[PDB]
Amino acid sequence: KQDMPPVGGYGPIDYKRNLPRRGLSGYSMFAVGIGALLFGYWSMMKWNRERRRLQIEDFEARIALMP
Amino acid sequence: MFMINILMLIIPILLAVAFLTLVERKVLGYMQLRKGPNVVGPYGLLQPIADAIKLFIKEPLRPATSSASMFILAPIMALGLALTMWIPLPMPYPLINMNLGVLFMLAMSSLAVYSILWSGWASNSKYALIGALRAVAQTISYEVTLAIILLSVLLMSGSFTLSTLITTQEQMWLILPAWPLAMMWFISTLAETNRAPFDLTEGESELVSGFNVEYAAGPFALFFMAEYANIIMMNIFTAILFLGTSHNPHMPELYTINFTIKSLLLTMSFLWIRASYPRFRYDQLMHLLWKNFLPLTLALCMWHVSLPILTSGIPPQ
Ligand SMILES: CCCCCCCCCCCCCCCCCC(=O)OC[C@H](COP(=O)(O)OCCN)OC(=O)CCCCCCCCCCCCCCCCC
Numbered sequence: 001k002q003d004m005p006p007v008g009g010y011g012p013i014d015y016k017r018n019l020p021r022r023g024l025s026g027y028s029m030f031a032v033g034i035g036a037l038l039f040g041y042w043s044m045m046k047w048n049r050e051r052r053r054l055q056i057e058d059f060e061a062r063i064a065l066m067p
Numbered sequence: 068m069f070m071i072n073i074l075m076l077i078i079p080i081l082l083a084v085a086f087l088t089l090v091e092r093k094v095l096g097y098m099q100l101r102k103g104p105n106v107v108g109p110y111g112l113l114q115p116i117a118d119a120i121k122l123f124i125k126e127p128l129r130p131a132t133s134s135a136s137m138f139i140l141a142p143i144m145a146l147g148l149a150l151t152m153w154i155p156l157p158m159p160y161p162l163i164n165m166n167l168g169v170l171f172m173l174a175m176s177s178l179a180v181y182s183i184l185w186s187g188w189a190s191n192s193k194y195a196l197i198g199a200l201r202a203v204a205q206t207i208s209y210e211v212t213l214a215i216i217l218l219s220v221l222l223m224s225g226s227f228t229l230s231t232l233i234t235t236q237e238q239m240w241l242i243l244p245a246w247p248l249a250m251m252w253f254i255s256t257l258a259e260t261n262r263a264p265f266d267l268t269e270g271e272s273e274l275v276s277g278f279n280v281e282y283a284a285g286p287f288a289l290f291f292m293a294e295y296a297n298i299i300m301m302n303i304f305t306a307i308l309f310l311g312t313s314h315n316p317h318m319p320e321l322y323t324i325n326f327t328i329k330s331l332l333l334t335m336s337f338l339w340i341r342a343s344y345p346r347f348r349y350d351q352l353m354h355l356l357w358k359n360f361l362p363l364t365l366a367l368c369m370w371h372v373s374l375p376i377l378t379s380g381i382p383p384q
């Protein structure tokens with residue numbers, strides 16, 4: 001008279017299938033990308049242009065000597 | 068004391084390829100929910116000094132049907148260019164100040180495939196005869212995916228030296244203005260240096276890796292050794308090019324501290340890719356170079372030609 005099945009206490013667990021979490025898609029991407037990339041080239045032309053100014057100063061000390 | 072500097076660079080890096088083989092599996096182990104080398108270390112840390120001596124005791128046979136002067140010449144050229152490439156590389160001061168050394172990397176990365184063409188031929192038959200011929204074929208095609216987008220940042224750097232490659236990045240961390248090129252920079256070195264998703268060189272279920280398949284643990288001990296010396300060298304080359312650190316002349320000590328921490332992080336990715344993704348089935352490997360990788364690389368090439376002109380932002384040299 002000592003046998004298994006309980007009178008109660010059950011679930012069940014699902015048979016389902018779901019993890020579609022979105023996700024920042026669909027014109028949200030391709031907009032943060034271009035907005036990041038244009039910040040890069042804007043951070044250029046303030047350094048590459050400025051290094052071009054110090055470049056001429058480096059040639060300047062050459063030319064003021066050599067006679 | 069120049070000669071004491073060279074030996075101060077070859078010897079402390081053979082530990083870092085021997086203490087990567089141990090971190091090859093501890094990192095790959097906790098992804099599987101299991102501990103590292105548990106019993107011999109105590110923590111593992113003494114594993115590779117025991118795992119090195121066994122190879123040089125175990126009998127180094129040569130195959131009877133093999134050639135002679137080719138089979139024992141490719142491991143000479145294996146460790147030669149795997150260690151010669153570490154020379155012109157600033158941290159913060161390089162050992163050698165080459166005028167143009169970025170090109171010298173491709174002058175060193177080109178000849179490595181000329182040993183695989185030897186060893187696949189030099190020993191024996193079909194599991195490395197044809198099975199290594201189609202390993203030279205993948206490594207040649209990923210230079211034109213490589214050499215173009217290596218040039219595509221030099222239009223913005225200014226010249227060919229590497230001291231300017233740290234000067235131009237004092238305020239930028241240059242992965243941002245070129246992040247499409249930075250993607251295909253990664254996958255190239257992921258497939259050229261013969262690693263886990265694009266594999267057929269080493270060999271999973273391909274040529275049952277028929278490029279080693281024959282070396283007993285005498286000459287085999289370098290092949291693995293030498294090879295692991297490339298993978299921490301494209302990582303030390305990516306992090307001096309895109310993700311450049313800051314140099315201070317009064318404090319060179321704080322350069323390297325903030326530097327070796329970064330090349331280690333990218334080196335983790337070559338381990339962290341292998342525990343996710345399956346192979347590529349040799350067609351689809353090369354089907355995505357021409358058809359898919361290559362026409363974008365010309366597209367950004369024409370983009371990076373005109374954009375320094377139509378910004379009036381010419382880099383000075
Ligand atoms: C199996 C064992 C038997 C084989 C043993 C021999 C194997 C040797 C294989 C080594 C192959 C490496 C060859 C690489 C050549 C490239 C060297 C180079 O270009 O160095 C860069 C530098 C350029 O000059 P620059 O940058 O302007 O200098 C600064 C000036 N302000 O140039 C310089 O700094 C100086 C240039 C002159 C230096 C001497 C010439 C260099 C080459 C000497 C070795 C000859 C090559 C041997 C054949 C190679 C075979 C693979």
Ligand SMILES: CCCCCCCCCCCCCCCCCC(=O)OC[C@H](COP(=O)(O)OCCN)OC(=O)CCCCCCCCCCCCCCCCC
Nearest residue numbers: 034246247248249250251253254264340344355359360363
């Ligand atoms: C107008 C202003 C200017 C506009 C600028 C706009 C900028 C846009 C930039 C776009 C260019 C950069 C993107 C590079 C292209 C991606 C490469 C590619 O095309 O892969 C295509 C590949 C082909 O397969 P598919 O077409 O999907 O067909 C099978 C479907 N059943 O399908 C694939 O997806 C393959 C995926 C890669 C294959 C290797 C995967 C192995 C693991 C690599 C992980 C790498 C992770 C990141 C790398 C490190 C990053 C730091």
